[model samples]
Target: MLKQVEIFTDGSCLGNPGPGGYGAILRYRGREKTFSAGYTRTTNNRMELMAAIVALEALKEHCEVILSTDSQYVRQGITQWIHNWKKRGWKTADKKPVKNVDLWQRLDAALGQHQIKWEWVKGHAGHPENERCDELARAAAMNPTLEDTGYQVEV
Candidate 1:
């Protein structure tokens, strides 16, 4: 039987386009691994996507994953929104190019590597894992010099 992993991820930004950070926790069979990183400038969604991306990338082998997040943007974007966006050639329902296509593409590839079930958790709602992830993210956001070269505003 394949191993089942539970993951919780969160992201925070001091300002919309200011310093940002991502946090993620992965657990399996009572063991857990945590990760966090900072960015000099980025958006909340980018950090959220980055958290999941990094978590999946850390996996050494295929497994069943349950990904939990407070960001509806990340959950819905990957599960439901991505399909239509891809079908529309990366355009949104409004016929405009999608934002964060780069990160989404990376996420899409990471997602293909595992059997993942996306879960939405309420933010700041006393969920233990989610709260810890949030704390890590917020702490990392204090660092203002992490470079994010791939981040750019989509026109």
Candidate 2:
């Protein structure tokens, strides 16, 4: 039987394309692992997607996962839009190139390693895990870093 894991994620940005950060909490068998990272330049959406990417990528083996996030972009994109995007050669329905393709590609790769059920939670709706993730994201954003230059470019 596959191990079951639960995850909560959140992202924050001081400015639309300025300092940003993502936080995630992974719970497995009552143990929790938290992750947070800051970017010198990135959008909240990017950070949101990064949270999922980082969480799934950390897993050492395939597992059944419940991934909860406050961003519809991440949930819907993965569950719905990604199929069409892939069918269209990574273009949106309007034939426009997909924005954030880099992160999306990375997320897609990470997702392939696990069976995930995506869940959307209302942000700031008093959910404890979501709130803690929000706090971690904000705190990480306060300490900007240029370690990931790929995220330093404006999207």
Candidate 3:
């Protein structure tokens, strides 16, 4: 392991495809940094994926990153589902193009620079780091305004 880093993340959305936000906390060498962003229109799943992407992007060097999240969609998407998705050119088992392929691709590239271990935590269960991330996510969602490039308006 070149370096060891730990990240905790959470995502929130006012509605399924409404205002959204993500929070990520990075811990390394006894120091910690928290990152959060609000998107005026997005999905909770996107927020979750964004958190992991943002966390990895902020890292300046390769490392052994143990990243934790409350969403199984993200944990399983990265750990298991992604393999098949890629084999089928980012399509699902039924051959439908994978949802959120944009973030998935970004995650794949972000992963190129580090050894990332994904963990799924039961959300809102009193875990300190997870709880903090939840707070950050919800707070950011409330003040959402940033544009999500992947999200397109139906108009």
Q: Which stretches of candidate 2 lie over 4 Å from their true place?
A: 1-3, 92-97, 123-126, 152-155
**lDDT by residue for model 3 (102-150), tens:** 6778888778777777676663554886888888888898877688788
Q: List the residue pairs that clash in candidate 1.
A: none
Per-residue lDDT of model 1, residues 78-107, tens digit only: 657887888777787778767777778877
lDDT: worst 10-residue window of model 2: 146-155
Q: Could you tell me every candidate's TM-score relative to the true structure?
A: 0.82, 0.81, 0.82
Q: Tell me the lDDT of model 1 at 69.
A: 78
Q: How many pairs of residues collide in model 2? A: 0
lDDT of 2 by residue, 1-155 (tens): 22478778788777878877877777775568887887877878888888887777777666777888768777678767898888778787667767777788888876777787877666456587787888898889987764555553254
RMSD of each: 3.1, 3.4, 3.5
| Descending-lDDT candidate ranking | 1, 3, 2
In candidate 2, residue 125 scores what lDDT? 60
lDDT assessment of candidate 3? 0.77
**Model 1, global lDDT:** 0.77
